[model samples]
Target chain A: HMMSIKLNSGYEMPLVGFGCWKVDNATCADTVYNAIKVGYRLFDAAMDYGNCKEIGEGINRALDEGLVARDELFITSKLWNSYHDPKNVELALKKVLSDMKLDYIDLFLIHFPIAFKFVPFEEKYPPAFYCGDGDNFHYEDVPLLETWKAMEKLTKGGKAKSIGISNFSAALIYDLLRGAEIKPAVLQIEHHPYLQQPRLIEYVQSQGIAITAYSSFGPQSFLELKHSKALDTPTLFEHKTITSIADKYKKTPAQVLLRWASQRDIAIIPKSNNPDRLLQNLEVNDFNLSKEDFDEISKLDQDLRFNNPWDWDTKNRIPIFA
Target chain B: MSIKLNSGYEMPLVGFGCWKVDNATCADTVYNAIKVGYRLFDAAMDYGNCKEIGEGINRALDEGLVARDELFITSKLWNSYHDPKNVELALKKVLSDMKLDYIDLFLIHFPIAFKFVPFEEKYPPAFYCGDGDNFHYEDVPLLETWKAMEKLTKGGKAKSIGISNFSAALIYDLLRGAEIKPAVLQIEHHPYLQQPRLIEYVQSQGIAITAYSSFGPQSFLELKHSKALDTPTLFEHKTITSIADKYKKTPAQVLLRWASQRDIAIIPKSNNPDRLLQNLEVNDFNLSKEDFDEISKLDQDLRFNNPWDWDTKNRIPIFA
Candidate 1:
């Protein structure tokens, strides 16, 4: 009921939400339940995140205590690369739904434009790139249209109230938009000041699609994983421009990053385990940065993407950007 | 066969690029290009000078400069006519404008599809959709357009079919659904923007590649692009100039030889007869392996002809 944006489908999606990435399996249940009490209604989940059932445990706990109704909570999850086959599209979604113990999710997105070789759930769940026990990443020849057509059936059947796509470039989105009967309601991307895609942001905004920005803290999310790309990039919090703006506003650097994107009407999901930080993340929706300061923050765009597949692994790199 | 196409057609390794050729000189240029022994003419509807190009081709054939069946003609289906129903009409119009019976190859101009603008509204209706100043696009998928392109090949209007300005990710899906894979993939390939992996993947799949903008920034400087202006011209770069001195050839020749050495086709445009002759004759000598690597090392992944650069406001990131 708070800090929401009106989607093209006329559904009100919260502008600030909780990211389910990197949430620990041990504490995911309590973390989700606590975030709910802290006023975070939206929880961004994915199969690759590997803690849906535990996260579901937390969601159910919060509902049982009358902290928030299931109707008030907006849960989002992604279809992994391995489940891109037309037959596997629903199969993957059903697994997430079954694990979460939810009848319907607020949104479901195609995780990436790429399709990996189909790997069954029994073989290995949340197969990132490996297929059928192969060490190397394999590609499936299924066009996005086939996978999207299958997704349309889920939206039409009411499992996912809306359908969206993530990690899609503007060109890929344009190609998908041409064939899709139900156009993507939102576009989720690896966006931050260091990797600001202004053109991509403007183009999708004009198409009447909402944009949800992931990795809003830039390299902060990837540093623990030891990604060299993220390691080399300076964190957004320490950047002079962002720090200066944050000090001027009497806000933390993290809130400044959140306000910078949400001010332009882009959605953000920044998770924090601490109750104080969780409220701070959700409370960033209302602030407005000055035009000059916002432009200065955009000037920090170096086209640096830390979560690129081309850099995921050298041997099995997919040149999706190329 | 210079470069064998998957469609079983033979395409020349060196050809004439007809983009940006003015209508006033198109006929004369095509006529003289044929007189200079250039058999392959890479033209498109967006170039908007096909009528004059046809006149030039007809005059050359009439004067016995080139035989009718000996020459290879290529044209592209523009973004406006990407709708399945308008595909044939677009081809016939291209054929009608040139007054030719059949084209050697027909290519989809871009993977991005714009809204269908009727022929009566505008001929070769580029970037305009009759609605407003903004670009309106159709809901037709690339598969639908490719299917229409396949029909052109079977119906004898297009001898072979290919695509231009498409990336590897887009090509992957097209091939999966396509009954006929594209024979050639035309892209903006120069030393400055050398996409080695894309070329390798595409060539591996049996599609011949046509390298456009072989001179890099030289092709786009006329439009005064900021990126083009800021970057050093490839022609004057010490690396290219140094190699040109070694080979006793002009920098343009060195650049052309680099692409030709990579086994990709080239379409170099030069209105000047001397430069035109120089561009078409690059295959006479080979560029050494080390020199070719030096040429490739200049890659910044810098692209000059990005759609987003055309109009920053209505940015259609066809390449992004």
Candidate 2:
């Protein structure tokens, strides 16, 4: 299916994209290779995911092994919070380029609208919310506008096909829109049946930015990690609403979640390790949930935010909205 | 659906939008407007009814209805002649068609630049251009385009120059770089879609504001526009219309009055002479402070213009 969501940057993004996060190097490679075999085209990758080489290798393996042409695939990478400085933007993009061994990435994003001070690769791998110490986060430390300006330069210099921002609040996006030279093309956020950021999505989309959804299943995707209360909360796999809708559509709860997003013309990146689940997830393009089915799932809106790292801190330095 | 456009000078709170105005009846309806009081006429070259508008202007002037300078006449720079050299040609053509010596304001219709082709290259609504070997370029940068607009002001082709449908980022760039700052920025503004930040930003920069499609739901319904139409009409919304009922005026008058009260100018296109007079008479009445807040709070950010087809499919960049 030729399903492409229109992005704010005037580009079309594949609706059914494979998210290659959390999976390890070899596994990510194998999964992506198999995903291509099953007809997946967009691969959602990130710097913090730490598997660019494997992800690239898997795509390369698919192309070399006579599976698919390079032009057929869409690859996306994100700039991590630790690398959110103008001085570090090029270096961060270069590292991803060097690791992936790809000439260019299809879409590059400022992973989070928030910024953190530059961290040397030696200090920590995937610097998760690097606060200096005690109560001081590094973001109170570096300006977001400076980091955004750097991200803008990437598109100007032709390093990436398009540039985007992820996890931006409506206010921050508007502020950026007020001052930006090259407006961001897409905003990737945690969108799901339970947590549809409609107002922000509408405002941003009205400005011509495309929306990419990660964790469309909400806590169902990351319920097992420490500090994640998702496991204790009502499980999407077992929830009456999700289960009833899944039975009606004859799809997995996850598939139903992914389909709901695509139906709304938003791009979705659902991750799966099992090859059977991968094919099923990729095949979400074939069917759409009914308007009633979509509305029923939408009724699950609890406004639950699963990926907020700022809520855990007290320095209060992070520009969560910026 | 319903889209807003900023008319010059008065900051028309709502454009009595006039996209499909016909040539036959445009004059009498406009003359009837003398009693209705709509002072600004939002006509354009592409509308193909300037001859009728000229008829209206002449009739209104001949009948001693309104002074020529009291009215705001606004038009647009169509895409085909976006080049600096062709600015006068396109503008002069519009002036001749309207039978007006000068217009109050001229706007660059859209940000998208198109190649300039001579009117003689393809007479009357010239469209085709470019060769297989190499495509012709517009040759005029936006700044160059703005510079051409500046010449129009200096040479009395127009009193002021402004932009329409430009984003905040686009305006910021122009504000920083343009030699002659635009007098206004025409855009889609309505109760449901009040671009608060953009409005505030532009206002801070000393640019006047004008809105189109003020009665968002009414305007859309008139066009049979296909977005969510079941929503409350701005004119009939209990908040606004009730206030109008209190004032013993129609909801249309209340909607226009609300925008005017905020100092935002409007060009409410109307053919009904009484309605036109009523639209212009909005300056005579005032909404109470409490009622004004209630109306302002009615904003749902419900926009009628999707322009989604122009986005990813057409490679037209929108902020969405």
Candidate 3:
């Protein structure tokens, strides 16, 4: 049996879920299907991932085999930056629903706090900061509260059961909380010891919004993308601070990393293509780390963030964290 | 205030910052600052020293040191008063205590909006709702509060309106919905925490930038903030000292000139009489391009005045 977190929306979400990012398209369907088979009840997806079709296919396969009931699974997808407008928000959900062929998703998130110009699906699906003018970046003028209200309507119609935001700093969350009729149930962010954002996490949790951490393994997630900063920093897996603790517990560095986050009550969605590693990530809550060990691991904070939105563009950027 | 603003107003290049200035000496300090040729006095409703500062302004006028028109007074609407109804009422109270018919500029102190505290309960609530003695939040979007800021400029109670403690992300949203763009974006901009990108973006929008804490950690160390305590003071940093030696000025003068030469406004304050005049004399010298870039190279992105670290538990991450 697994632990669950009750959201402000009053729905229970599994504490440990399978991350669906950068899962190669060839294996994405089987990866998701096998993740459900391996006891992963939650799957985080995004239109920006460009693989929701495979992710949805995997979910349907799990349902077809009666491996898990659709109601038993907690599926999360995000509203891409391009669909931040109220009207674009109105249609963007349908595109995901159509591609994934799901009646409703458990949670839908505003992918990043920033918004890009609307790119029609016909022009390109999962538009990567392209405003239809060949790599030129343009901003669409919509306040977060305005976009949040449109997202609120998604819950009213039952397309999404709960709504939340990702990559948003405290100021945006503070402002959004003011106008939000349906309070945010979760806040997904890139949280690792190196970029712990201790105050931000505590403030968000104090506000009753559950926190979900991506990139829980630090630079390991971005090594595939070849980010200069990630390439330059030492990997957490090889870090002596993490390895010594992993050796003490006779656990893999991955498990120690996931447990470090779980101890803080932060939900984690670490990814793995191999089933053995997948189970290792999901079964992290079995043991408790000593508070001293937890402190030692936390003391490794460098405030180094790999997935910053400020670096998304050359200029005309959105410095959400900056 | 001599710098031209997008609002078609001119602000002094150097002003006296009133943060953490003891209320006991606020009157004498403001009057002394006026005597030392400091025209702009940047105070805030949350400073809790406006009544005393008003007395100083009156004494200056009575002594014929300066006229009302020659002096520029700026105050801010605190976070607790972001409600549209509370906006003008708060400004009215500020005007009443300051004994002024109108002020040169008013600013939204921070982008945050805490729950409204009634005047009867607490006059200037500092992040506390005070009923349970706990932090409580109000459901007021920043745009709604900014709309109230926009409304202030219409009736001449506030000659010009601006924002403080705002990031580019927060300001962009306000700009989108605003009828009147913010005349200035005041931020902590010392050499150790130079926000070059943010400053570039704000200035390109025709808004002027006002740099506070030009001496960096020197200003916050008095408050015993851990971050400031751990940081190297800009006044003694070898690079800054070297630049000061080159200019034949004090390290403080070199720090102020770095910002003033960049056309960024500075609000460095001092209680010492000689240092006060020295603070106002930053315009007397300029930094060479290499020295300017040397100071700029010290940017650690270190910020001292974050609401997130205000309390161990009751944090407000307005600048996070």
Candidate 4:
């Protein structure tokens, strides 16, 4: 079983979780169901992923078979950009809850700091990238505080156990803290050797908010997107320095990457269908990388960001990644 | 006199300022400015005299005073153009008024966004008046404005894009999402209003800093702002005078050089030929480390160009 950390809301979240980003809907149920059987207690899902129904199905199946209770699992979902308007925030969360068939989510996060124009649920459920036409995505003129206020309502109304943000810059988070009634419980960001974001992590952690890392394998997740920049980057798994460290410890390179993040007191959610890799990813607490080795890995920071929205559209550039 | 931009273009470190230059004398002043080795003419549509500034540049070019490439011209997109749809249109209007094909560097005048007043209503609607002297604010975010500015770079309308009057926190937030990172950040930086932390942060990001209002409260004094009336001028400051006497230079020269020595680009506006020459020749001498440290201690965060003080509403949240 994986160790858990106490959140500001007094909820215990497992250190390692199963990331459900690109998990196909056709196999998501089986994958999540299998992940639960393998002792994975946390399942990170997002509205934009468009597979909450399957995720809920897997969770229900696991519960029916007496694998795990609903209270035992920590499920996380995100509010899509289109629902950034306060009016749509609750509705969007309701859709997630209905799809997942959950009474209250363990954690809910604002997927991105950006606010997209509100698209009706009847038009599209998640509204992943609905811009009127020709990729012209319009902003919803709603301030971040308005959305945050609505999110605060979710916690008060017992819809979400805790609320947090993802993909937000330190400066933005600092600004939000000024007007926020309820402080954010966690911050989820892309973390790896290349895009370490040490200062950002330090600032966020200093505020007593827990951090969860996505894309812990550096450019591994973005490589399938055919992102030329991600393709050009050397994967942390195959990196000679990481591989050498892994060999020295008699572990796989993937374990070295996950261990490096966990060593920094950061929670990780690396996904894998292969049972062996899933088990290896969770077994990071066994060995501790030395301070010198940790510093050596930290020095690999290149500020390289692969999941930037700027690359999504050529003509209509999204400055969210700017 | 030029600093190499990250965009691979050369920008004049000391530019001739066109702000407050009246339409009648604006053309003559600009013509004289060009004839006196001033290659960069910083103008903005908000100044309401782009046509005159353009006429001066055209005359200078016609009379073989300077080549088009030899001179670097910069103008600003005003607050009214912060809306993405209005950004390019405003740039095109500036180009038409200036009779120029392209601008050397274009800056977002301020980090504030105001309601879009049509050009027919007002050429450069500086401040939107909704609540009687209190400025009206639009919901257009800075990110939207920056993306529009980035598009200007691709179309060759503005060779390089920059920001003016943006705070450190605002700039830091902007850097996180900018594909075309700001090449320059223009802020009010005099001996008294020296923003050390902001300067350090901006320079660390490889963005050049441009100093406006180099004379501290003097610019505000002309505008009759209450805060400026209360403060003493940097020209009369004991430290500045002592440094001037030590270097055998005027107090104004000392103030300008103090900024220049710190690798800061300064725009000290002066109409007098002698003073303009003195301002332009600031690069000739250098300040010692001792004097530099002495001047560094003069920082009081006494900002003169605060948008919050523009009216009661604090419409521009850049400072907030």
Candidate 5:
């Protein structure tokens, strides 16, 4: 089992969690249930993931089998872009809770600092390209601060135990920090060896908030997505430095990569359905990477950010980077 | 001599504007302001010399030259503490620094955000109380931010509340949404960078406007005293100098009067005793409407003070 860290809200959270980004609904339920059997107690699901019900069902299965209690598990969900308006905040949250069959969420985040008009499931699922094939996908009319105020209300109302934000750059984060009443408790970002985000992460850490890494294996996780061509590039699973370090430590490359992030005081969500691989992923904390090894691993930070469909400049679109 | 916006504010017709006065010189410069009949004094929490300005004001009042209520004193809230809960915290700090029971007016320095940096924090710039779990503050929105500002006005912490350096779009939005209308809008209003249409819109909205950097090119020139703007000094502009020559007053006086005659509040910062008095005396004499018109025609919309030029990578042009 991954180590647990005390959250700002005085609750414990596993340092490593199971991710459900690209997991389809058909296999997501059984896979999630199996993850709990392998000692993974944290699961990150989102409204856009479109598998909230499946993820919820997996948790129910674990409960049915007496594997883990609801309190023993840490669940996180996000309010989608279309839900950034304050009026829809509670409805968006309530829908997620009803879908997950949970009374409260451990953490609820404003998925992206940017906001969009309320998007319905029937209109489009996961509207990743909500800009409607336009270059100005950035929501210039609805300000980030307006959306943040809505998020602040959730914690006050007890709908979310803790409130946080994700996908914000340093400048935007600084702006939010300047005006926030209750500081956001976490900043979930796309972090990996290739994009360590050292300054930003250090800055966030210095504020006494936690950072959770979403794409720990980087492109390997995104490569399977229909829109993602991440496989065309070098995968962290196959990278020479990662594999060599894993060999030197007698650990798998995936384990070594997860360990590197854990040692940096970062939380990660590496999802897998393989029983042996899941157990190996859960044990990353057993070994620590040396400074030299960590330095070498740090070089992998090509600063490649794969998850930000927002930064996709579609005018020249194909993909900004291969 | 550019036509300043008629913001309906009863700002100092001509007074001292303090930006670079250090602790040592601030009191003396402020005392000089009182000697020159300058009434309004603009200071901010970020300026680091609220105490000195206060000291000078106290000295002037003690000496019986001016009554405390007679002066139109203004100060601004800093960017470091913009959270509605933190507004009063920062204001109290400024109040203690200035030693004032109430300020004549207070402004939100900018429509921007800074990390929650405390005075004790190491090098707190835009973001102060930054950490891992919360490196950046989720800025309270401007409308909510304005809600906090309205509280100060209702609480009597400030006699009036205004905004500084806000854009036309933002000011317009604020006008439409504000519960208590803003008393004034402060922006760069020098001869070079006259924002005419925006100024007119603000005026039509019944908002009083005040001009900073009144002697556009001159203020920067005096600070660095750089010769970069010397080619066409406000004090040396042919039209201004000719008008000054006609009225037997310094070109500085002509420029201040040009703004004063148009009912635009002017704060021409000058350290020189003679220059300060000349700036103040402009209200005693009026520029002929034709001369004022001619000077207004000299507008080139030139701007010298730019917050964007600061060597930071934020990449936002503060006034562009």
Candidate 6:
């Protein structure tokens, strides 16, 4: 069984979960079903990923096959940037519920602090980019506080058990806490050796918010995005130091990366369709990296962020990570 | 004549100022400044001499003294244009008045947002008129203004963008939502208002720092702002005079070099030909590390330009 961390919202989250980003719909259901059978209890999905139905179907298959009950699993989804207005927030959540075929999501996160123009569900379900116009992405005037208030209502209304934010910087989180009615239960960010963000981790954790790290392997996720920097970046899996350390411990480089994050009490969501790799990712708690190895990994921090919107369009800048 | 910008562009470290330069002499002074090897001209719509500054540039171009690309021009978006929708319109107005296709660097003059007034009403509405003793403020946030500024970069109206008069906390908050990071942070950074932490943080983020009011209370002293008048001028400070004597430099040159030695850019305004040349030649000498450290120790956070004091009890949220 995977180890769990108790959240401030009274929910027990698995220290290791399956990240649903880039997981194909054709195999996501079976992959999730197989993951649950192999002792996985947490599954992270997002509206922008466009695969919630498959994730839900997989969870249902696991339940039908006597793998895990509804109460035993944790299901997380996110509010997309396009639906930041308070008027569109509930409709967006309901769409996620209908697609997933779930009664309530375990946790719902504001995917990004940015507020984009409201795109109707008929116009586009995910609306990943605004309006398909270069430098003309319509922005909604809704403040983060207004959208967050709507998220707080989702928790009180039983639609979402807990609400949190993702991709938020330390300064933004501090400002949000001043006006937030229900303190965020978690903060999800891209975390890896290259972009460790140690200060942000300490600040959020100090406020009793659990950190969920996506992209546990640096630059791996964005490599497919054809990011020039990400393309040039060496994969953590192939790093000489990591591979040598893995050779000494008789574990995979992937396991070392997952363990490094978990060692710092940070929750990680690593995705793999391969059953052996899935099992290898969950078994990170068995061995601990020595202080020397841990420090060596920490030394690799260069504050490089791959999932920046600024790189998407040079003209139409989104100063989200400015 | 030029300093390399992080944006891969060259900017003149020394600039001719239009702050107190009246329209009568603004055009002639700027033309003279260009002829005297000064390639940068810093103006703002709020300075109320952009048209005159443009005339100077046009004269230089007409006389074949300098080309458009050879000059590094800077202007600012005023407080009223903090609204996203009005940012572009305000910038275009500056371009129109200045007769420039693009600006080298454009800065958000201040972090505060005032009530938007039409250009026809006021070319640069410095502040909002309120009922009684209150200052009226617009509902637009600083992030909205920055996003608009970023759009200007995309539109190619501003080659590089920056912020002015933003506190460290405000800059930190602004960076969280910025897609295109600020190229520069211009603040009042004389000895009295050192802002060491702010400078350190901004530079570490790969943004350049530009120091205004290099003479500290001297400018405000002229304005007869009581606080500025009460404070001792750096030109008369014993330490400053001793350092100037040791280096065989004038008090002004010593002060400008103090900022330059720290790798901070300085823009000291002067109409006097000798003083202008002295300001430009400040880079020729270097201050010892010990002398630099001693000069830095004179920091007292004595900000002459406190937006909080603009009104009775901190009307602007930017400073607060």
**Residues forming the 10-long window of minimal summed lDDT in candidate 2 chain B:** B1-10
lDDT of 6 at B256: 86
Output the lDDT of residue A319, model 5. 17
Interface RMSD of each: 1.8, 9.9, 1.7, 9.8, 11.1, 9.0
Worst 10 contiguous positions by lDDT, candidate 6 chain A: A222-231
TM-score of each: 0.90, 0.58, 0.91, 0.58, 0.54, 0.58
| Model 3 CA deviation exceeding 4 Å by range | A220-232, B21-28, B55-69, B114-136, B195-197, B218-232, B270-274, B289-304, B309-313
Residue by residue across B158-203, what tens digits does model 1's lDDT show? 9999999998878877886899999999999888888877887788
Candidate with the greatest DockQ versus the true structure? 3
Scanning candidate 2 chain A in windows of ten residues, the lowest lDDT window is: A222-231
Ranked candidates (DockQ, high to low): 3, 1, 5, 6, 4, 2
Task: Give lDDT tens digits, candidate 1, residues A101-140.
Answer: 9999989999988888888788887677677755767777
TM-score of chain A of 6: 0.94
TM-score of chain B of each: 0.94, 0.80, 0.93, 0.93, 0.83, 0.93
Model 5 TM-score relative to the real fold: 0.54
DockQ of 4: 0.05
For all candidates, the clash counts are 0, 37, 5, 4, 41, 7
Model 2 misplaced regions, further than 4 Å: A1-92, A95-212, A218-242, A247-252, A259-322, B1-39, B52-71, B83-85, B111-156, B167-181, B192-205, B217-237, B269-277, B288-320
Root-mean-square deviation of every model: 3.3, 9.9, 3.0, 14.5, 12.9, 13.4
Per-residue error at A65 for model 6, in Å? 3.2
Candidate 5 contains a number of clashing pairs equal to 41
Candidate scoring better on lDDT of 4 and 6: 4
User: lDDT (CA) for every model shown?
Assistant: 0.84, 0.70, 0.84, 0.81, 0.72, 0.80
